[PDB]
Structures are given as C-alpha cells and as structure tokens.
Amino acid sequence: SMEQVAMELRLTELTRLLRSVLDQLQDKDPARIFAQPVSLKEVPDYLDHIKHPMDFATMRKRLEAQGYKNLHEFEEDFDLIIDNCMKYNARDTVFYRAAVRLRDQGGVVLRQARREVDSIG
Structure with a gap:
C-alpha cells in the first residue's frame, strides 16, 4: 500500500537521524570504553551482575536493521x-568516570534530537 511505503520512509528517515545521534554520542567516548560488548571470555561472571548488557556496536546493529x-x-x-x-x-x-562524562555530554545531544523528532514528526 501507499501508506506502508510512507511509513517505511518515516522509519528510514528516523534511522538516518538516529545514525547521526549515535555518531555524536560515540564521539563523547573517545577512549572507546563503550564501543563493544563486555567480553565474557575476559569477564566471565558479567551476566551474573548485569542482566541486559549493551554497547555501541550492538546499538549500531539494531539501528541498521x-x-x-x-x-x-x-x-x-x-x-x-x-x-x-x-x-x-x-x-x-x-x-565509571567515562560513563558519567558520556551521560553529561550526551544529554545535550539528546535534548535536541528530541526536539528534531517531535518537529520533523
């Protein structure tokens, strides 16, 4: 249908905006502490601590899908x-300190993305 296409175009454009957001957030992690999943070879008990692991590569896979x-x-x-x-x-x-800096610096980037998403619909 033409509606399904139009919705697909909205999702495509959201994906484009989120891709730029993700690039801006990741620049706020210059040490690359959050670039990849915590290694279960190197931190074998991680999942006993953290139930929903996340990292920037895993977000990027989800985004591109x-x-x-x-x-x-x-x-x-x-x-x-x-x-x-x-x-x-x-x-x-x-x-920990890298996370605090990422949070503080990302807040600015996300504050405006929220306006751009509301604005561009």
Whole structure:
C-alpha cells in the first residue's frame, strides 16, 4: 500500500537521524570504553551482575536493521550502557568516570534530537 511505503520512509528517515545521534554520542567516548560488548571470555561472571548488557556496536546493529521505532527506544539502549557501567564498576574507576562524562555530554545531544523528532514528526 501507499501508506506502508510512507511509513517505511518515516522509519528510514528516523534511522538516518538516529545514525547521526549515535555518531555524536560515540564521539563523547573517545577512549572507546563503550564501543563493544563486555567480553565474557575476559569477564566471565558479567551476566551474573548485569542482566541486559549493551554497547555501541550492538546499538549500531539494531539501528541498521531499522530496529528502533522511536527515539525513546534508542535512548533506552543508551541509558543501559551508562547505567550498567555505573553499577558494575566502582566510583573510583576510569570506567565509571567515562560513563558519567558520556551521560553529561550526551544529554545535550539528546535534548535536541528530541526536539528534531517531535518537529520533523
């Protein structure tokens, strides 16, 4: 139908906007602490601690499958990255501190993405 096409075009354009959001958020992680999943070879007990692991590569796979239907879902995944890190790692660690900086700096990028998603519909 023409409606299904039009909806597909909306999802395509959301995917384009989220792709730019993801690139901007990941630049706020220059040390690449959140680039890939925590390794279960190197942290074999991770899943006893963290029930819903997340990282930027895993978000990128979901994005390119047009697997985010709205910005809320995308933000949920970003928030997991930060919140998982801040639980698993102690306050006095480079990991925790990197998460706090990512959260603070990403907030700005997400504040405007929310306006761009509401605005462009």
